[PDB]
Design goal:
The structure is a homodimer.
Chain A (H helix, E strand, L loop, with lengths): L24 H22 L10 H9 L8 H15 L11 H11 L2 H14 L4 E7 L5 E7 L10 E7 L6 H4 L3 H12 L2 H19 L1
Antiparallel strand pairs in A: 1-2, 1-3
The structure holds zinc ion (2 copies).
One zinc ion (ZN) binds next to helix 1 of chain B.
Chain lengths: ~210, ~210
Protein backbone atom coordinates (compact mmCIF):
# COMPACT_ATOMS: atom_id res chain seq x y z
CA UNK A 1 0.00 0.00 0.00
CA UNK A 2 1.14 3.51 0.88
CA UNK A 3 4.92 3.48 1.02
CA UNK A 4 7.11 4.69 3.89
CA UNK A 5 10.27 6.77 3.72
CA UNK A 6 12.07 3.87 5.45
CA UNK A 7 14.32 4.69 8.37
CA UNK A 8 15.39 8.29 8.84
CA UNK A 9 18.75 9.92 9.53
CA UNK A 10 18.20 11.70 12.79
CA UNK A 11 20.56 14.66 13.24
CA UNK A 12 22.63 14.87 16.42
CA UNK A 13 20.84 16.75 19.21
CA UNK A 14 23.18 19.75 18.81
CA UNK A 15 24.66 21.89 16.03
CA UNK A 16 27.36 20.16 14.02
CA UNK A 17 30.04 22.48 15.42
CA UNK A 18 28.76 22.33 19.01
CA UNK A 19 31.31 19.73 20.17
CA UNK A 20 34.38 21.79 19.22
CA UNK A 21 37.25 21.68 19.91
CA UNK A 22 36.87 18.15 21.24
CA UNK A 23 35.03 16.76 18.21
CA UNK A 24 35.31 19.01 15.17
CA UNK A 25 32.70 20.13 12.65
CA UNK A 26 34.64 18.18 10.02
CA UNK A 27 34.26 15.01 12.07
CA UNK A 28 30.50 15.30 12.41
CA UNK A 29 30.23 16.27 8.73
CA UNK A 30 32.14 13.11 7.85
CA UNK A 31 31.01 10.74 10.61
CA UNK A 32 27.34 11.74 10.64
CA UNK A 33 27.08 13.33 7.20
CA UNK A 34 28.63 10.40 5.34
CA UNK A 35 29.05 7.19 7.39
CA UNK A 36 25.84 7.35 9.42
CA UNK A 37 23.91 8.63 6.37
CA UNK A 38 25.33 5.71 4.36
CA UNK A 39 24.32 3.09 6.95
CA UNK A 40 20.73 4.40 6.88
CA UNK A 41 20.65 4.64 3.07
CA UNK A 42 22.18 1.19 2.62
CA UNK A 43 19.73 -0.29 5.13
CA UNK A 44 16.76 1.28 3.34
CA UNK A 45 18.01 -0.23 0.08
CA UNK A 46 18.36 -3.72 1.60
CA UNK A 47 14.79 -3.77 3.00
CA UNK A 48 13.07 -2.53 -0.17
CA UNK A 49 10.36 -5.00 -1.07
CA UNK A 50 9.73 -5.99 2.56
CA UNK A 51 7.69 -4.60 5.44
CA UNK A 52 10.67 -4.28 7.79
CA UNK A 53 10.46 -0.49 7.87
CA UNK A 54 7.17 -1.00 9.73
CA UNK A 55 9.30 -2.24 12.62
CA UNK A 56 11.41 -0.18 14.98
CA UNK A 57 15.12 -0.08 14.21
CA UNK A 58 15.60 -1.97 17.50
CA UNK A 59 13.31 -4.73 16.21
CA UNK A 60 15.18 -5.00 12.92
CA UNK A 61 18.49 -5.45 14.76
CA UNK A 62 17.06 -8.18 16.99
CA UNK A 63 15.39 -9.90 14.06
CA UNK A 64 18.45 -10.01 11.81
CA UNK A 65 20.96 -10.96 14.52
CA UNK A 66 19.71 -14.56 14.18
CA UNK A 67 21.56 -15.73 17.31
CA UNK A 68 24.92 -14.80 15.74
CA UNK A 69 24.51 -16.10 12.16
CA UNK A 70 23.61 -12.61 11.06
CA UNK A 71 21.19 -11.89 8.19
CA UNK A 72 21.99 -9.34 5.45
CA UNK A 73 20.39 -6.29 7.09
CA UNK A 74 22.06 -6.63 10.49
CA UNK A 75 25.23 -4.58 9.97
CA UNK A 76 23.42 -1.57 8.52
CA UNK A 77 20.55 -1.78 11.00
CA UNK A 78 22.86 -2.19 14.00
CA UNK A 79 25.17 0.59 12.79
CA UNK A 80 22.22 2.91 12.21
CA UNK A 81 21.01 2.23 15.74
CA UNK A 82 24.52 2.42 17.27
CA UNK A 83 25.26 5.79 15.67
CA UNK A 84 22.04 7.41 16.84
CA UNK A 85 22.77 6.12 20.34
CA UNK A 86 26.30 7.54 19.93
CA UNK A 87 25.30 11.12 19.08
CA UNK A 88 22.86 11.16 21.99
CA UNK A 89 25.54 9.79 24.34
CA UNK A 90 27.44 13.11 24.17
CA UNK A 91 26.78 16.82 24.54
CA UNK A 92 28.46 20.22 24.61
CA UNK A 93 29.88 20.62 28.08
CA UNK A 94 29.84 16.90 28.78
CA UNK A 95 32.34 15.07 30.93
CA UNK A 96 32.50 15.36 34.68
CA UNK A 97 30.96 12.73 36.92
CA UNK A 98 27.48 11.19 37.12
CA UNK A 99 25.20 11.76 40.09
CA UNK A 100 22.35 10.14 41.97
CA UNK A 101 21.20 6.63 41.15
CA UNK A 102 23.65 6.23 38.26
CA UNK A 103 26.68 7.18 40.37
CA UNK A 104 25.54 4.86 43.17
CA UNK A 105 25.11 1.92 40.81
CA UNK A 106 28.48 2.53 39.16
CA UNK A 107 30.12 2.61 42.58
CA UNK A 108 28.29 -0.50 43.80
CA UNK A 109 29.31 -2.52 40.76
CA UNK A 110 32.76 -1.01 40.06
CA UNK A 111 33.82 0.09 43.56
CA UNK A 112 33.99 3.76 42.63
CA UNK A 113 33.58 6.01 39.62
CA UNK A 114 37.35 6.29 39.13
CA UNK A 115 37.66 2.47 38.99
CA UNK A 116 34.78 2.24 36.52
CA UNK A 117 36.33 5.05 34.49
CA UNK A 118 39.70 3.35 34.13
CA UNK A 119 38.07 0.02 33.27
CA UNK A 120 35.84 1.62 30.64
CA UNK A 121 38.65 3.62 29.03
CA UNK A 122 40.86 0.52 29.10
CA UNK A 123 38.20 -1.69 27.50
CA UNK A 124 37.64 1.00 24.86
CA UNK A 125 41.36 1.00 24.10
CA UNK A 126 41.91 -2.76 23.93
CA UNK A 127 38.96 -3.60 21.63
CA UNK A 128 40.98 -4.36 18.52
CA UNK A 129 39.88 -3.35 15.04
CA UNK A 130 36.47 -1.80 14.42
CA UNK A 131 33.84 -1.72 17.15
CA UNK A 132 32.18 -0.27 20.23
CA UNK A 133 32.54 -0.22 24.00
CA UNK A 134 29.42 -0.02 26.13
CA UNK A 135 28.16 0.51 29.63
CA UNK A 136 25.01 -1.63 29.84
CA UNK A 137 22.34 -2.63 32.37
CA UNK A 138 21.21 -6.27 32.71
CA UNK A 139 18.26 -7.32 34.87
CA UNK A 140 18.18 -11.09 34.29
CA UNK A 141 25.96 -7.11 39.26
CA UNK A 142 23.55 -4.96 37.23
CA UNK A 143 26.04 -2.77 35.32
CA UNK A 144 28.58 -4.27 32.91
CA UNK A 145 31.17 -2.96 30.49
CA UNK A 146 30.79 -4.63 27.08
CA UNK A 147 33.10 -4.78 24.09
CA UNK A 148 31.54 -5.55 20.74
CA UNK A 149 33.10 -6.00 17.29
CA UNK A 150 32.02 -4.12 14.17
CA UNK A 151 28.25 -3.46 14.31
CA UNK A 152 27.28 -5.73 17.23
CA UNK A 153 25.67 -4.12 20.26
CA UNK A 154 24.48 -5.50 23.61
CA UNK A 155 20.73 -5.37 22.66
CA UNK A 156 21.52 -8.60 20.85
CA UNK A 157 21.99 -10.16 24.33
CA UNK A 158 19.02 -8.47 26.08
CA UNK A 159 21.28 -5.94 27.82
CA UNK A 160 20.01 -2.37 27.95
CA UNK A 161 22.82 -0.12 26.66
CA UNK A 162 23.42 3.09 28.60
CA UNK A 163 26.60 4.53 27.10
CA UNK A 164 28.73 3.80 24.08
CA UNK A 165 31.89 5.03 22.41
CA UNK A 166 32.49 4.43 18.69
CA UNK A 167 36.05 3.15 18.22
CA UNK A 168 35.82 2.61 14.49
CA UNK A 169 38.76 4.54 13.05
CA UNK A 170 36.41 6.87 11.18
CA UNK A 171 35.17 8.09 14.54
CA UNK A 172 38.44 9.79 15.52
CA UNK A 173 40.92 10.07 12.61
CA UNK A 174 40.01 13.69 11.83
CA UNK A 175 40.53 14.82 15.44
CA UNK A 176 43.07 12.38 16.85
CA UNK A 177 44.49 10.54 13.81
CA UNK A 178 45.50 7.13 15.16
CA UNK A 179 45.69 8.18 18.85
CA UNK A 180 42.58 6.38 20.08
CA UNK A 181 43.56 6.60 23.77
CA UNK A 182 43.52 10.41 23.48
CA UNK A 183 40.16 10.16 21.74
CA UNK A 184 38.83 7.88 24.51
CA UNK A 185 40.13 10.31 27.14
CA UNK A 186 38.63 13.46 25.64
CA UNK A 187 35.37 11.53 25.30
CA UNK A 188 35.11 10.89 29.05
CA UNK A 189 36.48 14.27 30.11
CA UNK A 190 34.54 16.50 27.72
CA UNK A 191 31.75 14.76 25.81
CA UNK A 192 29.90 12.02 27.73
CA UNK A 193 26.37 13.12 28.63
CA UNK A 194 25.80 11.66 32.08
CA UNK A 195 22.26 13.09 32.22
CA UNK A 196 21.36 11.03 29.15
CA UNK A 197 22.99 7.94 30.66
CA UNK A 198 20.90 8.41 33.81
CA UNK A 199 17.72 8.82 31.75
CA UNK A 200 18.54 5.56 29.99
CA UNK A 201 19.17 3.78 33.29
CA UNK A 202 15.82 4.93 34.70
CA UNK A 203 14.18 3.44 31.59
CA UNK A 204 16.09 0.16 31.80
CA UNK A 205 15.12 -0.13 35.47
CA UNK A 206 11.45 0.53 34.72
CA UNK A 207 11.42 -2.08 31.93
CA UNK A 208 12.95 -4.62 34.31
CA UNK A 209 10.54 -3.89 37.17
CA UNK A 210 7.61 -3.89 34.76
CA UNK A 211 8.63 -7.30 33.38
CA UNK A 212 8.12 -8.72 36.88
CA UNK A 213 4.68 -7.10 37.20
CA UNK B 1 73.54 -12.14 25.80
CA UNK B 2 73.86 -9.53 23.07
CA UNK B 3 70.52 -7.87 22.31
CA UNK B 4 68.72 -7.31 19.01
CA UNK B 5 66.94 -4.22 17.75
CA UNK B 6 63.75 -6.30 17.48
CA UNK B 7 61.69 -6.24 14.31
CA UNK B 8 62.45 -3.50 11.82
CA UNK B 9 60.06 -1.20 9.98
CA UNK B 10 60.92 -1.98 6.41
CA UNK B 11 60.13 0.91 4.03
CA UNK B 12 57.93 0.31 1.00
CA UNK B 13 60.00 -0.75 -2.02
CA UNK B 14 59.38 2.59 -3.80
CA UNK B 15 59.53 6.28 -2.82
CA UNK B 16 56.59 7.35 -0.63
CA UNK B 17 55.11 9.48 -3.43
CA UNK B 18 55.61 6.92 -6.20
CA UNK B 19 52.03 5.68 -6.00
CA UNK B 20 50.48 9.10 -6.70
CA UNK B 21 47.88 9.84 -7.67
CA UNK B 22 46.34 6.45 -6.85
CA UNK B 23 47.70 6.40 -3.32
CA UNK B 24 48.92 9.72 -1.99
CA UNK B 25 52.14 10.70 -0.21
CA UNK B 26 49.95 11.64 2.76
CA UNK B 27 48.47 8.14 2.80
CA UNK B 28 51.92 6.53 2.91
CA UNK B 29 53.08 8.99 5.58
CA UNK B 30 50.07 8.13 7.72
CA UNK B 31 49.58 4.45 6.90
CA UNK B 32 53.22 3.39 6.76
CA UNK B 33 54.75 6.13 8.90
CA UNK B 34 52.28 5.93 11.78
CA UNK B 35 50.10 2.79 11.64
CA UNK B 36 52.70 0.33 10.34
CA UNK B 37 55.37 1.97 12.50
CA UNK B 38 53.11 1.66 15.55
CA UNK B 39 52.46 -2.06 14.96
CA UNK B 40 56.20 -2.80 14.85
CA UNK B 41 56.96 -0.57 17.85
CA UNK B 42 54.13 -2.13 19.89
CA UNK B 43 55.19 -5.63 18.90
CA UNK B 44 58.76 -4.88 20.00
CA UNK B 45 57.52 -3.61 23.35
CA UNK B 46 55.38 -6.73 23.83
CA UNK B 47 58.27 -9.17 23.29
CA UNK B 48 60.83 -7.39 25.44
CA UNK B 49 62.07 -9.92 27.95
CA UNK B 50 61.67 -12.91 25.59
CA UNK B 51 63.59 -14.40 22.68
CA UNK B 52 60.82 -14.07 20.09
CA UNK B 53 62.84 -11.55 18.10
CA UNK B 54 65.18 -14.43 17.20
CA UNK B 55 62.19 -15.82 15.25
CA UNK B 56 60.85 -14.71 11.90
CA UNK B 57 57.73 -12.56 11.87
CA UNK B 58 55.96 -15.56 10.30
CA UNK B 59 56.97 -17.79 13.21
CA UNK B 60 55.68 -15.31 15.77
CA UNK B 61 52.35 -15.02 13.92
CA UNK B 62 51.93 -18.81 13.83
CA UNK B 63 53.07 -19.17 17.44
CA UNK B 64 50.68 -16.58 18.80
CA UNK B 65 47.59 -17.60 16.77
CA UNK B 66 47.01 -20.52 19.14
CA UNK B 67 44.43 -22.27 16.92
CA UNK B 68 42.17 -19.19 17.17
CA UNK B 69 42.56 -18.15 20.82
CA UNK B 70 45.17 -15.57 19.93
CA UNK B 71 48.01 -14.75 22.32
CA UNK B 72 48.93 -11.15 23.15
CA UNK B 73 51.56 -10.58 20.45
CA UNK B 74 49.35 -11.78 17.59
CA UNK B 75 47.61 -8.61 16.44
CA UNK B 76 50.83 -6.60 16.23
CA UNK B 77 52.86 -9.44 14.75
CA UNK B 78 50.16 -10.22 12.20
CA UNK B 79 49.64 -6.56 11.31
CA UNK B 80 53.38 -6.06 10.97
CA UNK B 81 53.63 -9.00 8.58
CA UNK B 82 50.42 -7.99 6.73
CA UNK B 83 51.58 -4.42 6.09
CA UNK B 84 54.95 -5.53 4.79
CA UNK B 85 53.16 -7.95 2.46
CA UNK B 86 50.83 -5.08 1.48
CA UNK B 87 53.45 -2.52 0.40
CA UNK B 88 55.09 -5.19 -1.73
CA UNK B 89 51.83 -6.22 -3.32
CA UNK B 90 51.75 -2.88 -5.18
CA UNK B 91 54.08 -0.89 -7.39
CA UNK B 92 54.27 2.33 -9.38
CA UNK B 93 52.67 1.52 -12.70
CA UNK B 94 50.94 -1.63 -11.50
CA UNK B 95 47.57 -2.95 -12.55
CA UNK B 96 46.90 -4.61 -15.88
CA UNK B 97 46.63 -8.34 -16.19
CA UNK B 98 48.87 -11.14 -14.92
CA UNK B 99 50.82 -13.22 -17.42
CA UNK B 100 52.27 -16.69 -17.73
CA UNK B 101 51.74 -19.30 -15.05
CA UNK B 102 49.84 -16.99 -12.70
CA UNK B 103 47.28 -15.93 -15.31
CA UNK B 104 46.80 -19.55 -16.37
CA UNK B 105 46.25 -20.71 -12.81
CA UNK B 106 43.79 -17.86 -12.19
CA UNK B 107 41.87 -18.69 -15.34
CA UNK B 108 41.83 -22.37 -14.41
CA UNK B 109 40.44 -21.79 -10.90
CA UNK B 110 38.22 -18.79 -11.69
CA UNK B 111 37.38 -19.40 -15.36
CA UNK B 112 38.84 -16.06 -16.45
CA UNK B 113 40.78 -13.09 -15.15
CA UNK B 114 37.67 -10.88 -15.35
CA UNK B 115 35.69 -13.33 -13.21
CA UNK B 116 38.55 -13.64 -10.71
CA UNK B 117 38.71 -9.84 -10.76
CA UNK B 118 35.02 -9.46 -9.96
CA UNK B 119 35.04 -12.08 -7.19
CA UNK B 120 38.12 -10.53 -5.62
CA UNK B 121 36.83 -6.95 -5.66
CA UNK B 122 33.44 -8.13 -4.40
CA UNK B 123 35.01 -10.11 -1.55
CA UNK B 124 37.13 -7.09 -0.60
CA UNK B 125 34.12 -4.79 -0.51
CA UNK B 126 31.85 -7.19 1.38
CA UNK B 127 34.38 -7.80 4.22
CA UNK B 128 32.65 -5.77 6.91
CA UNK B 129 34.68 -3.75 9.41
CA UNK B 130 38.47 -3.96 9.64
CA UNK B 131 40.27 -6.67 7.73
CA UNK B 132 42.01 -7.92 4.63
CA UNK B 133 41.19 -9.78 1.42
CA UNK B 134 43.66 -12.23 -0.06
CA UNK B 135 44.55 -14.26 -3.09
CA UNK B 136 46.19 -17.40 -1.71
CA UNK B 137 47.72 -20.72 -2.80
CA UNK B 138 47.02 -23.97 -0.97
CA UNK B 139 48.94 -27.17 -1.61
CA UNK B 140 46.50 -29.48 0.24
CA UNK B 141 41.37 -25.63 -6.75
CA UNK B 142 44.84 -24.30 -5.90
CA UNK B 143 44.06 -20.56 -5.77
CA UNK B 144 41.48 -19.20 -3.34
CA UNK B 145 40.09 -15.80 -2.38
CA UNK B 146 40.10 -15.34 1.41
CA UNK B 147 38.51 -12.68 3.63
CA UNK B 148 40.04 -12.15 7.06
CA UNK B 149 38.99 -9.87 9.94
CA UNK B 150 41.25 -7.43 11.75
CA UNK B 151 44.82 -8.85 11.78
CA UNK B 152 44.20 -12.46 10.67
CA UNK B 153 46.01 -13.61 7.54
CA UNK B 154 45.94 -16.99 5.73
CA UNK B 155 49.40 -18.11 6.98
CA UNK B 156 47.47 -19.10 10.09
CA UNK B 157 45.76 -21.78 7.96
CA UNK B 158 48.90 -22.88 6.04
CA UNK B 159 47.88 -21.00 2.90
CA UNK B 160 50.59 -19.14 1.05
CA UNK B 161 49.36 -15.55 0.56
CA UNK B 162 50.00 -14.23 -2.94
CA UNK B 163 48.21 -10.87 -2.89
CA UNK B 164 46.40 -8.79 -0.31
CA UNK B 165 44.46 -5.58 -0.02
CA UNK B 166 44.21 -3.71 3.28
CA UNK B 167 40.60 -2.67 3.91
CA UNK B 168 41.05 -1.08 7.32
CA UNK B 169 39.54 2.40 7.08
CA UNK B 170 43.02 3.91 7.55
CA UNK B 171 44.12 2.31 4.28
CA UNK B 172 41.95 4.61 2.20
CA UNK B 173 40.34 7.53 4.07
CA UNK B 174 42.93 10.03 2.82
CA UNK B 175 42.41 9.06 -0.87
CA UNK B 176 38.82 7.79 -1.04
CA UNK B 177 37.16 8.87 2.24
CA UNK B 178 34.55 6.15 2.88
CA UNK B 179 34.39 5.02 -0.77
CA UNK B 180 35.96 1.60 -0.26
CA UNK B 181 34.69 0.19 -3.58
CA UNK B 182 36.49 2.96 -5.49
CA UNK B 183 39.66 2.28 -3.49
CA UNK B 184 39.38 -1.39 -4.44
CA UNK B 185 38.78 -0.52 -8.09
CA UNK B 186 41.82 1.77 -8.24
CA UNK B 187 43.88 -0.85 -6.42
CA UNK B 188 43.25 -3.64 -8.92
CA UNK B 189 43.48 -1.30 -11.87
CA UNK B 190 46.54 0.80 -11.02
CA UNK B 191 48.59 -0.60 -8.12
CA UNK B 192 48.66 -4.41 -7.96
CA UNK B 193 52.13 -5.80 -8.77
CA UNK B 194 51.30 -8.93 -10.74
CA UNK B 195 55.03 -9.53 -11.21
CA UNK B 196 55.40 -9.81 -7.42
CA UNK B 197 52.30 -12.01 -7.15
CA UNK B 198 53.83 -14.34 -9.76
CA UNK B 199 57.10 -14.46 -7.79
CA UNK B 200 55.16 -15.43 -4.65
CA UNK B 201 53.32 -18.15 -6.55
CA UNK B 202 56.61 -19.60 -7.80
CA UNK B 203 57.87 -19.93 -4.21
CA UNK B 204 54.55 -21.37 -3.07
CA UNK B 205 54.69 -24.10 -5.72
CA UNK B 206 58.36 -24.76 -4.94
CA UNK B 207 57.52 -25.04 -1.24
CA UNK B 208 54.76 -27.53 -2.04
CA UNK B 209 56.98 -29.42 -4.51
CA UNK B 210 59.76 -29.67 -1.91
CA UNK B 211 57.13 -30.69 0.64
CA UNK B 212 56.61 -33.94 -1.30
CA UNK B 213 60.06 -35.29 -0.35
ZN1 LIG C 1 30.89 5.38 13.47
ZN1 LIG D 1 46.78 -0.94 7.34
Amino acid sequence: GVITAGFELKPPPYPLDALEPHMSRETLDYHWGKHHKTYVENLNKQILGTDLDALSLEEVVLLSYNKGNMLPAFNNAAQAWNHEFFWESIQPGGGGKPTGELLRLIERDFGSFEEFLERFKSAAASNFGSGWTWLAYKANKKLVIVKTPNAVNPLVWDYSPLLTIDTWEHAYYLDFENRRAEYINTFMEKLVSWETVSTRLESAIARAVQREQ
